[PDB]
């Protein structure tokens, strides 16, 4: 979800 979207975006 959005937390995961942020995890992916910042990788």
């Amino acid at each position, epitope marked *: *979800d*959005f*937390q995961d*979207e*942020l*995890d992916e*975006f*910042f990788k």
Partner: antibody
Amino acid sequence: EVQLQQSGPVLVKPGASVRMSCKASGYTITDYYLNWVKQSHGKSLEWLGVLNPYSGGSLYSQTFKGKATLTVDRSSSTAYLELNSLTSEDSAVYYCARQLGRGNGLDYWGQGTSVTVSS
Amino acid sequence: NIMMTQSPSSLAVSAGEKVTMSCKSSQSVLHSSDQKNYLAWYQQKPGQSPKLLIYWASTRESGVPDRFTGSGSGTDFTLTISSVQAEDLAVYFCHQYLSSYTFGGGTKLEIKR
């Protein structure tokens, strides 16, 4: 020293669009993510989304999806926020604010751009 | 989203007094991969942009005076100013960045003299 220089205040009519800029200096713009945050009054902050200046891609709050568009010009180390379909409720100061990585706070904020939407 | 609530809305103290202010999240802000609470505090002085004070709920940002300390876990967080200085008047905001970023409504610290 680190600086984020934002463009000046603007007046725009309802229904119009506006683009504002945020120029990074004293550091390399690629090393930090760049967030945009609206302040509508002194006791309010609302996040719009975040730009990766290296790639040029962005992640947007669902609130601002299709309303805001983030871009970057790396040759001038300048990030941009465009807002469309403006209403009186979009009048606010808009800040750009850098963030090193996922787990970091927003460690340096620009001085803000005041946008007034009015007839 | 995760809702952030701050209390009190404002408070006033004389220079030298200790103050505590509260930030409550509607759910956990703990990030599992690093076991950090993704919770930041900012200070916004009148006419200035916000300044980052604390991140990870309790880690002080470089240059931030020792008098500012963040604490808490779960959904209950606190900012303490151990000995308030006249220049500390500001609105203090909390911020969660676990999910789509949200901010508290601010606590306005005023000075008595």
